[PDB]
């Protein structure tokens, strides 16, 4: 088995739990296999679709 790890968006995951969005709280998370701890706010920058 050959794994393309963290080179593209991932859609093959095993576990999942129900969670809801929270703002302005520096809390731990796991975004697409990447872990961090920070608040969630908005920004004015523009994101290209790719």
């Amino acid at each position: 088995l050959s794994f393309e790890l963290l080179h593209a968006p991932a859609t093959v995951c095993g576990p999942k739990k129900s969670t809801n969005l929270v703002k302005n709280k520096c809390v731990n998370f796991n975004f697409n296999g990447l872990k961090g701890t920070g608040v969630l706010t908005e920004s004015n920058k523009k994101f290209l679709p790719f």
Binding site: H7, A8, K45, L48
Partner: protein
């Protein structure tokens, strides 16, 4: 099934310049307001292209 061609005119290939062509994203990761160096296969600038 193919049809042979006998009306071809003999003409040696021409060469033009490649001033600012032959650049792409080295990886799928997105970076902003930084200057990064990546070693990868690329078309050199100011060279013949057929």
């Amino acid at each position: 099934q193919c049809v042979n061609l006998t009306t071809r005119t003999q003409l040696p290939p021409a060469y033009t310049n490649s001033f600012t062509r032959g650049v792409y994203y080295p990886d799928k990761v997105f970076r902003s307001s930084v200057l990064h160096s990546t070693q990868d296969l690329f078309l050199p600038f100011f060279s013949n292209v057929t």
